[PDB]
Amino acid sequence: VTDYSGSGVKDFVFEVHRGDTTKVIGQRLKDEGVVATPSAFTDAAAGNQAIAAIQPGFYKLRTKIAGKEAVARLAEQDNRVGLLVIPEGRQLDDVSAVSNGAVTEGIFTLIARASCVDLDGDKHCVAASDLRQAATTASQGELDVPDWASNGVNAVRDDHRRIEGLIAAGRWDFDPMAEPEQILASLIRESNAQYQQLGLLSSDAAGLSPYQVLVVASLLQREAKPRDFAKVARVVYNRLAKHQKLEFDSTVNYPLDRQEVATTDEDRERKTLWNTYVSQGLSGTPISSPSPEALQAAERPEPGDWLYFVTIDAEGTTLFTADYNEHLANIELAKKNGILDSAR
């Protein structure tokens, strides 16, 4: 049957849909002018495991090519485009290390990098600043902000940080040729489905909204090691109940876009929507994209009366207590064991 020869005509982005079989992909490849007949694709794909296991997503292909060439291009990992990984605890912005270490790239930078497609020579990317602007100004309906987050987003005006926490840690696909608003919206929709699957909307923890649970998880992700998440969650709720400020360093560092570092009394005094040295209560928005385990801890805090915690040694032991004098003793223990500076 008819099957194209030669090197093709035009590079473009092709989407494999969820539920597409090899046969259906062959039909769609014919309809988009990639292969001359569907069986040109399916014959060449027979017994190919890369094609059999192909994932829904976006793929750089070329028009008017041979079936075996279409198969090779689809099976080549490098032609995958709009595939994004957001590691746990990332922010929207890049975060500098004043610890003398390297920059930590944020979600905008990672989306932009994931968006790049080489089309007939032209490298085509969405720019991080365009994603940031769309986060700053697009309407909630345009970003598909979920209902449980609507009021939290609304209280933060003309700041991209209004959508913090809404793009979850995980692995996502997005159309690299769509507008910045639609890219952000699809990410937020996929994240909302994951958050639902991870229990964010169906939690029975008394007196907490889903948005508040997300905020707590984002704090835990930045302040504690995974082993301690559940206990730190209890500390947070105990302090909220006793109207004691959280005094989390990560809430000071978050808007300065800087990594885990000690904070001065000057920094702790700056009034922001997030600073928990200044104000009682939770941060106004999440301060990071939390891991699934931080979410589970925020939903199911370990029972206990602790109000204080500090890491005291090299192996990461963390002592929790409800007694302030014991907490002072544990702080000094961390200083003698070398973990914490003798003076701030």
Numbering used by the authors: 1 to 344
What did the paper state?
One type of enzyme involved in this process is membrane-bound glycosidase, which cleaves the PG sugar backbone. Lytic transglycosyl­ase (LT), anchored to the cytoplasmic membrane, is a representative glycosidase enzyme that catalyzes nonhydrolytic cleavage of the β-1,4 glycosidic bond between MurNAc and GlcNAc to produce muropeptide products containing a 1,6-anhydro-MurNAc (anhMurNAc) end [Fig. 1(a)]. In a previous study, MltG was characterized as the terminase responsible for achieving PG integration into the cell wall through cleavage of the newly synthesized glycan strand. MltG consists of three domains: an N-terminal TMD, a predicted PG-binding domain and a C-terminal YceG (MltG) catalytic domain.
To obtain a soluble protein for studying the structure of maMltG, we constructed an N-terminal truncated version of the MltG expression vector, in which the N-terminal 84 residues of MltG (i.e. the TMD) were removed. The purified maMltG protein was crystallized and the 2.2 Å high-resolution crystal structure of maMltG was solved using the MR phasing method. A single maMltG molecule was identified in the asymmetric crystallographic unit. Thus, we believe that maMltG exists as a monomer in solution based on the SEC and MALS results. However, there is a huge structural discrepancy in the various locations of the PG-binding domain, indicating structural plasticity between the two domains of the MltG family.
